[PDB]
Amino acid sequence: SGIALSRLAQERKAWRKDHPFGFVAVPTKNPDGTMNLMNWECAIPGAAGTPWAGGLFKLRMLFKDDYPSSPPKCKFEPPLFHPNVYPSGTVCLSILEEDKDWRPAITIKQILLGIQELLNEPNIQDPAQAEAYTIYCQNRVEYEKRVRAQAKKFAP
Ligand SMILES: S=c1[nH]c2cc(Cl)ccc2o1
């Protein structure tokens, strides 16, 4: 898709010029070794001073051929403990749904910062996994304890 590919080239140029520190966002390759702008390997650092500090959380971003009409699918690999991350790893966030708050102008940087903000502030009206949601609701201290253990697990 020429429209998608031209936008994704724009996004990559902008990302490389200015991105938030500690974040990664890199296109993958096709079986012939050429660049695949439709599938990016990304990583989000935990925010300092939070329970997520020191973790680096790997995420795949998958673009459909009609991008930027549609948002990318954003999937933690491996899946994470968080109330708004499905067991598959897929992120549930309103800016990431075409029929909710996605707008074509939203950039990859905005998406990744939006997901980082989600990590430290769950949306309890919108749960995506039972376990993290239940613990978040029942015992915030235990929730934080689990988040810290996960961040350690995913430290570089
Ligand atoms: S290494 C390594 N593998 C990987 C996969 C994804 Cl989806 C994102 C970041 C990654 O870093």
Q: Please tell me whether the peptide bond between 78 and the residue prior to it is cis, using omega within 30 degrees of 0.
A: yes
Rounded distance between C-alpha atoms, residue 107 and residue 3, angstroms: 15
3-state SS, one letter per residue, for the chain: CHHHHHHHHHHHHHHHHCCCCCCEEEEEECCCCCEEEEEEEEEEECCCCCCCCCCEEEEEEECCCCCCCCCCEEEECCCCCCCCECCCCEECCHHHCCCCCCCCCCCHHHHHHHHHHHHHCCCCCCCCCHHHHHHHHHCHHHHHHHHHHHHHHCCC
Please name the fold of domain 1-156: Ubiquitin Conjugating Enzyme (3.10.110)
Give CA angle at 63 (58, 67), nearest 5°: 140
Answer yes or no: are the C-beta atoms of 46 and 148 closer than 8 Å: no
| Cβ of 77 below 6 Å from ligand 1 | yes
At 54, list the tokens.
């020191």
Resolution (A): 1.1
| Cβ of 144 below 6 Å from ligand 1 | no
CA of 75 to the centre of ligand 1 (A): 11
Cα 129 to Cα 55, 72, 92, 126, distances in angstroms: 21, 20, 10, 9
Rounded distance between C-alpha atoms, residue 149 and residue 156, angstroms: 14
74 is catalytic: no
Rounded distance between C-alpha atoms, residue 24 and residue 130, angstroms: 29
Residue with tokens 């490389």: 16
